Design a protein around this ligand. Structure first.
Ligand SMILES: Cc1cc2nc3c(=O)[nH]c(=O)nc-3n(C[C@H](O)[C@H](O)[C@H](O)COP(=O)(O)O)c2cc1C
Ligand SMILES: Cc1cc2nc3c(=O)[nH]c(=O)nc-3n(C[C@H](O)[C@H](O)[C@H](O)COP(=O)(O)O)c2cc1C
Lengths: 217, 217
């Protein structure tokens, strides 16, 4: 099988973790750098990836399922790490300056060009909310990073469970300081599936017919 | 360098294509199958990938820049193929029926189990607009597929240019029948970069400091 196809046909959404297996620090470092290298519109990188690693942090994450989507709750303590994909509520010229200043330091643009680079900020203004927020534009950028992570995990042979069945309001309460100025609509559990109890590990993957999703013109 | 990191450090946004080079049909088939295999919330797959391959289709795509974002226009005819990432405007039971029906055909689930499997639809209703549209939920799913595509292209060593600088309204007119019931906010040109005029090929990649985007708890 073609290496790319094999990876994508074999990755799947785990429904049960093995609590005695952890992701190595070597593999976690590759995953985190892969997230950091994700592309985004105008290199805005309007995101924050919060890694739930310690037992203390796992408890806080476990508690965020207090009143909602409790089918996802068992994974928190059983998996190795949980990663929260947060997207920025409002993206400002100051936030963009952080990006452009780093670009000047990394040698891709010069100081005079920096002011010239501020024209791309047009894209941010084109995506302003009725309330002055940009979440409808920043959230999709975080999902791009998520697509990148799922492909990355398939290559490392690490199991995972993407989760939209989370409580954004409660997470904003529990991780008050960390999520300040951001919102989180999706999380990702990673680890190793249970050798016998993960029923999804043996089910066939199902997707729509090629002609139903692809059109060649 | 670690294979995953090398791929992600070496992929970049091409700013000029070599018009004499095309993506092979074998590579294109891998890319399209990779898109089809993308994960999505509840396996909704609320997308359509429109591939602009023919000269006739390239002309139509070229014409969609008549009013705005002309800086992206030169790539259309110069690149090999352009792929439109379309997300569904409103997701219904009928739509989910196509997913569940294919699931049974794939032997992932049974006919009787199909009706029980319909209980995941809570997520769709959960994301329903006051206008009965789910575009704020479907668009992020398409961006996940895009993140998957960018990683896939890095592995195939094919150059690309993601584009949000497009005209969704004009695209809806030009590709009237193909985009009916969908909207398109992002496109992707693929091909091979110009050997000496793609300035971005020799510029360093720049991303925020690890500490600025990642928090370990
Ligand atoms: C954005 C998103 C949210 C999802 N949320 C959940 C969730 O809350 N819990 C869970 O068990 N699965 C969830 N999934 C898993 C999907 O059901 C799964 O990706 C889809 O059925 C395709 O199957 P595969 O992932 O096994 O290929 C989610 C996937 C995505 C990409
Ligand atoms: C959603 C999205 C939209 C983008 N739109 C454009 C575009 O319209 N034109 C273009 O030249 N570059 C565009 N880019 C390219 C980004 O500027 C680029 O991904 C970002 O600067 C990081 O650089 P790299 O892609 O070179 O790593 C876009 C990227 C993304 C992911």
């Amino acid at each position: 099988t073609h290496p790319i196809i094999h990876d994508l046909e074999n990755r799947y959404t785990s429904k049960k973790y093995d609590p005695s297996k952890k992701v190595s620090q070597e593999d976690l470092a590759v995953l985190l750098e892969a997230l950091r290298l994700s592309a985004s519109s105008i290199n805005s990188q309007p995101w924050k990836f919060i890694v739930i690693e310690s037992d203390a942090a796992k408890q806080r994450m476990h508690d965020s399922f207090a009143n909602m989507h409790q089918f996802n709750q068992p994974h928190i303590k059983a998996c190795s790490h949980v990663i929260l994909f947060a997207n920025k509520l409002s993206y400002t010229r100051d936030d963009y300056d952080v990006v452009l200043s780093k670009a000047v330091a990394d040698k891709r643009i010069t100081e005079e060009q920096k002011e010239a680079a501020f024209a791309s900020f047009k894209f941010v203004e084109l995506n302003c909310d009725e309330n002055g927020e940009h979440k409808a534009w920043t959230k999709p950028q975080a999902y791009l990073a998520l697509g990148n992570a799922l492909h990355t995990l398939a290559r490392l042979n690490i199991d995972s469970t993407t989760m939209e069945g989370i409580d954004p309001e409660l997470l904003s309460e529990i991780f008050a300081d960390e999520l300040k100025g951001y919102e989180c609509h999706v999380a990702l559990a990673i680890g190793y599936h249970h050798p016998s109890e993960d029923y999804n590990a043996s089910l066939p993957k199902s997707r729509k017919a090629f002609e139903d999703v692809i059109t060649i013109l």
